Amino acid sequence: ASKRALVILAKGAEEMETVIPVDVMRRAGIKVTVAGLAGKDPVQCSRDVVICPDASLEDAKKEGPYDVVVLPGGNLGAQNLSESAAVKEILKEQENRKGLIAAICAGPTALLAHEIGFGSKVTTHPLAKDKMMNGGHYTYSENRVEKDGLILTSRGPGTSFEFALAIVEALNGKEVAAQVKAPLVLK
Amino acid sequence: ASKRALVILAKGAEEMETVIPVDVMRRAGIKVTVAGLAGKDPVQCSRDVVICPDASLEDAKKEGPYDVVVLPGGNLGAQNLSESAAVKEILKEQENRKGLIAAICAGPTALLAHEIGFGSKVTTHPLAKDKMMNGGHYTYSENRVEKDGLILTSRGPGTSFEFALAIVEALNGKEVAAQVKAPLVLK
Numbered sequence: 001a002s003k004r005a006l007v008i009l010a011k012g013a014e015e016m017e018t019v020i021p022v023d024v025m026r027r028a029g030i031k032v033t034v035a036g037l038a039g040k041d042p043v044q045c046s047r048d049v050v051i052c053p054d055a056s057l058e059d060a061k062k063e064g065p066y067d068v069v070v071l072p073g074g075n076l077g078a079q080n081l082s083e084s085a086a087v088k089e090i091l092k093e094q095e096n097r098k099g100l101i102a103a104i105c106a107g108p109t110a111l112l113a114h115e116i117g118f119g120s121k122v123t124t125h126p127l128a129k130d131k132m133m134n135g136g137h138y139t140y141s142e143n144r145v146e147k148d149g150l151i152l153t154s155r156g157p158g159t160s161f162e163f164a165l166a167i168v169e170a171l172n173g174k175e176v177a178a179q180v181k182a183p184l185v186l187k
Numbered sequence: 188a189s190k191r192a193l194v195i196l197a198k199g200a201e202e203m204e205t206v207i208p209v210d211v212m213r214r215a216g217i218k219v220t221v222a223g224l225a226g227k228d229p230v231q232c233s234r235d236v237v238i239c240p241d242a243s244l245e246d247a248k249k250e251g252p253y254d255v256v257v258l259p260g261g262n263l264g265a266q267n268l269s270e271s272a273a274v275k276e277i278l279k280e281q282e283n284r285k286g287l288i289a290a291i292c293a294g295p296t297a298l299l300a301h302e303i304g305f306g307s308k309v310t311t312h313p314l315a316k317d318k319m320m321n322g323g324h325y326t327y328s329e330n331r332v333e334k335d336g337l338i339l340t341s342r343g344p345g346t347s348f349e350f351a352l353a354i355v356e357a358l359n360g361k362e363v364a365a366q367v368k369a370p371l372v373l374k
């Protein structure tokens with residue numbers, strides 16, 4: 001059976017961090033749902049790219065659970081994710097069922113806000129480190145991608161391919177990730 | 188005065204190759220217009236990401252000329268660009284005025300279709316090489332980014348940051364490109 005990914009898309013999301021994982025996971029045969037935090041309407045990303053979500057988060061949640069829940073970064077996107085009671089519920093449920101949670105750039109700060117995965121080794125964008133580390137509830141890493149069990153984090157737009165391929169490897173295995181990677185012309 | 192970029196967005200465009208240059212150029216202070224080939228309506232990219240263009244191409248052309256015209260790849264996107272008389276007119280005008288033209292992945296095959304920049308050194312996605320080289324009207328390169336004068340080409344999703352940063356360097360200089368690059372966490 002095909003794996004299923006939920007990508008939570010908030011106003012101010014970093015569009016590169018949103019699109020690269022969506023595209024790469026689709027390349028891997030994953031069924032991806034781009035879910036609008038605010039509802040069904042188009043979303044103005046951080047650099048003004050406008051993306052039309054597949055569904056509202058409200059609707060997508062009804063089709064859960066998912067093999068991965070993906071949180072893009074962007075400071076303002078991550079803040080909106082961190083402030084959301086709906087996101088809290090989704091992540092809590094995912095963690096409780098031992099499902100993968102993947103977050104990039106400022107995205108991992110929503111894990112802090114929602115008390116997810118405390119004790120995990122994590123990375124973030126360098127500028128989000130102090131926020132993520134407030135309280136010392138995680139151990140910090142400078143690895144471009146960090147996978148500690150079912151908490152998978154990464155650093156920025158420039159680590160988005162690596163992040164996406166790590167998700168693919170976690171869900172579909174090393175060989176599928178390598179097959180997906182080759183046509184992309186990555187260094 | 189701020190530089191201005193026209194990004195031509197067709198059905199079947201590769202969304203990563205569209206979003207990465209838009210975002211990165213905006214980070215560089217470039218005024219970017221995401222112009223819908225087909226009109227003003229949202230565009231279904233190659234991996235089903237839906238992007239809402241800033242304007243129709245018809246409308247954006249009225250606000251020309253631009254310091255760069257950018258052609259994303261995606262096989263089907265590039266085919267739509269190659270078949271467009273409106274694209275032909277834009278590229279011909281750009282070339283005639285010694286304005287930069289930038290194309291990635293299968294995107295450079297639209298330069299062939301529209302007889303642009305013959306004699307230039309170019310690259311493409313490896314799978315688009317034979318198409319681009321039909322007639323021997325260009326010289327082929329395996330460089331991740333190739334800039335031959337005012338024709339700037341690149342290879343794939345995984346070269347999109349390098350492509351975008353080369354555009355930024357061409358328009359705004361080396362120091363701006365380096366400043367834009369650092370926060371991205373590129374390898």
Ligand SMILES: *[C@@]1(=O)C(=O)[N]C2=[C][C]=C(F)[C]=C21
Nearest residue numbers: 014073074075105106370371
């Ligand atoms: C990232 O997307 C984010 O969440 N925070 C941040 C800062 C700088 C940057 F270049 C990207 C990002």
Ligand SMILES: *[C@@]1(=O)C(=O)[N]C2=[C][C]=C(F)[C]=C21
Nearest residue numbers: 183184201260261262292293
């Ligand atoms: C690219 O975006 C395109 O235009 N052609 C092609 C083939 C394979 C790939 F992975 C990307 C692209």
Ligand SMILES: [Cl-]
Nearest residue numbers: 046074075076
């Ligand atoms: Cl941001």
Ligand SMILES: [Cl-]
Nearest residue numbers: 233261262263
């Ligand atoms: Cl394609």
